[PDB]
């Protein structure tokens, strides 16, 4: 059977730079070949898009080792890249190469929102905090209700790297019952990475 081995699994690359992805196959392709070799780019939530066909993406290699080169790397190239070998008996894909962009550090644009009148009518309470357009991905967030830290009923969710500014964003959601929410008044949303802890708060 045809096995495709892609390397590296992930790639962190600076803008403007030259990035190369490899795919090795167990079934040699001659130039007149039963098989084909092609490259795909997949952005999250989208179909793979066929590549290569003075382009920024170009292919090389024949026989067993195939390379995809991106030159220069640009911001919206953040995606997973797949090689695909096409053959009459089977088609197969490589494991994928996740392409990460390197950029300068950035600080989150924090926002915090209180439960809505609609949700309070329902009998639940959700406090939502957006930490938008920061870099690097790894960020810890804590929050305190009138100074008291809470580890219960918090929802964290990260976006994919942005296609335009190469920054990550994140959404934290603290859910308490309606009645537990009424007891207190001071809610603060705290982000890390001068340390400069960014804090957003709302009262009552």
């Amino acid at each position: 059977d045809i096995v495709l081995t892609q390397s590296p699994a992930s790639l962190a690359v600076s803008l403007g730079q030259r990035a190369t992805i490899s795919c090795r196959t167990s079934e040699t392709i001659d130039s007149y070949g039963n098989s084909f070799m092609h490259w795909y780019q997949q952005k999250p939530g989208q179909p793979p898009k066929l590549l290569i066909y003075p382009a920024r993406f170009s292919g090389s290699g024949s026989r067993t080792d195939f390379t995809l080169t991106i030159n220069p790397v640009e911001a919206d190239d953040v995606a997973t890249y797949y090689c695909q070998q096409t053959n009459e008996v089977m088609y197969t894909f490589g494991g994928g190469t996740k392409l990460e962009i390197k950029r300068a550090d950035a600080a989150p644009t924090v926002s915090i929102f209180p439960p809505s009148s609609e949700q309070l009518t329902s009998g639940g309470a959700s406090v939502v905090c957006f930490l938008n357009n920061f870099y690097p991905k790894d960020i810890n967030v804590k929050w305190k209700i009138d100074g008291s830290e809470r580890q219960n009923g918090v929802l964290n969710s990260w976006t994919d790297q942005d296609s335009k500014d190469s920054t990550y964003s994140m959404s934290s959601t603290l859910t308490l019952t309606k009645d537990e929410y009424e007891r207190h008044n001071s809610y603060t949303c705290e982000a890390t990475h001068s340390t400069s802890p960014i804090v957003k708060s709302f009262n009552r």
Binding site: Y40, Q42, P47, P48, K49, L50, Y82, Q84, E88, V89, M90, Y91, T92, F93, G94, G95, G96, T109, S111, F113, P114, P115, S116, S117, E118, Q119, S122, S126, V128, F130, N132, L155, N156, S157, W158, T159, S169, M170, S171, T173
Partner: protein, 212 residues
């Protein structure tokens, strides 16, 4: 070239069968070879099989031999993938693609969920907010099943400053939020509403953001 339209998302009980379709338009629909690909959430692309509509020949990945059946309706220019004995491992996005030596196209994907859990619509709560240059608004959609759900702002007019976050699953329900950062001059001067679509429960909801 060719364009491909896949059928909508499906929630199905374990042990049942589903048939998902890929409807084709354009020139020489008989000339393309149709194939199907599976992608589990966060996983790589997996070839299911192909069918050549010209001679009817088919080839399957050994892992789907028992599971999947590919057919083409020549009259209606529709390719089908029948999946049987469904279990949670069949929960995934399924792609339909067609190709010949001139051209290849892919469908948008079909999200299939194999679950005992019952369909549940989302609760949509608006999030309204300092006078900065820019203001951030938000939408919270909570307690829905299954995925997917679609959020747009002002029926798609606002796309530049949107952040829609991957849904997260708790108990048997999903929750996500999306945010829009907009210039303060524009809002509340211009109305900005959040549009939420839940195909599985056949519900669309529009919530205008309003300052408390």
């Amino acid at each position: 070239e060719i364009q491909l339209q896949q059928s909508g998302p499906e929630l199905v009980k374990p042990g049942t069968s589903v048939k998902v379709s890929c409807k084709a338009s354009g020139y020489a629909l008989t000339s393309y070879t149709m194939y199907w690909v599976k992608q589990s959430h966060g996983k790589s692309l997996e070839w299911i099989g192909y069918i050549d509509p010209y001679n009817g020949g088919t080839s399957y990945n050994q892992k789907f031999k028992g599971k999947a059946t590919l057919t083409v309706d020549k009259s209606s220019s529709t390719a089908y993938m029948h999946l049987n004995s469904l279990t949670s491992e069949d929960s995934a996005v399924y792609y339909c693609a067609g190709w010949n030596r001139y051209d290849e196209d892919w469908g948008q994907g079909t999200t299939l969920t194999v679950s005992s859990a019952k369909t549940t619509p989302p609760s949509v709560y608006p999030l309204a907010p300092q006078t900065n240059s820019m203001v951030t608004l938000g939408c919270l959609v909570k307690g829905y099943f299954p995925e997917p759900v679609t959020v747009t702002w002002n029926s798609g007019s606002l796309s530049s400053g949107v952040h829609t976050f991957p849904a997260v699953l708790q108990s048997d329900l999903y929750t996500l939020s999306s945010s829009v950062t907009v210039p303060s001059s524009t809002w509340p001067s211009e109305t900005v509403t959040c549009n939420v679509a839940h195909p599985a429960s056949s519900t669309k909801v529009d919530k205008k953001i309003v300052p408390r």
